[PDB]
Amino acid sequence: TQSHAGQCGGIGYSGPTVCASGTTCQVLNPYYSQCL
Numbered sequence: 001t002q003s004h005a006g007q008c009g010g011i012g013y014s015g016p017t018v019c020a021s022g023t024t025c026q027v028l029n030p031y032y033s034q035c036l
């Protein structure tokens, strides 16, 4: 479960793209997305 400030789901990330409750996967860069 991706936590706040962690990379939730950008290109290159094949891991679990689900953020912890309270946060949303905010894609900033195409490869860097962060749970906010």
Ligand SMILES: *[C@H]1O[C@H](CO)[C@@H](O)[C@H](O)[C@@H]1O
Residues within 6 Å of the ligand: 002, 003, 004, 005, 006
């Ligand atoms: C999940 O992890 C983030 C850091 O990656 C923390 O800021 C958050 O409070 C939670 O422990």
